[PDB]
Amino acid sequence: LFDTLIVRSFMTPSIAALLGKWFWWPQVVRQRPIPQPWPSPA
């Protein structure tokens, strides 16, 4: 109960969010992709 409702539910993704690209450190990942242009309508 404690594990699934606290640790895995909030603490692990929170640590993954604090350490943005350092969560995967040896791999070089981007915090976000290159921004895209707003799409043509429909």
Binding site: R32, P37, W38, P39, A42
Partner: protein
């Protein structure tokens, strides 16, 4: 630097679809997130998160609360684009 109102709504509606399920046919520039679209304040947070991730448009928390209509978000994004 002049992403048109239709283009911004088109890009915003396909995030609103994934977040909520509302078709882009319903996302029109005069609808209210709370009243018409029924989008709570915590779904707006992820709309803003995904908008920043996809198009680079950063909307802080203090300014996200004052965007009542879709037109307000479009105007905010356009005024931010103008710089």
């Amino acid at each position: 630097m002049a992403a048109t109102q239709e283009e911004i709504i088109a890009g915003l509606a396909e995030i609103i679809e994934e977040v909520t399920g509302i078709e882009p046919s319903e996302v029109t520039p005069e609808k209210s997130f709370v009243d018409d679209l029924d989008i709570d304040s915590l779904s707006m947070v992820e709309i803003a998160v995904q908008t920043e991730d996809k198009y680079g448009v950063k909307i802080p928390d203090e300014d996200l609360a004052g965007l009542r209509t879709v037109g307000d978000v479009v105007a905010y994004i356009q005024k931010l684009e103008e710089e």
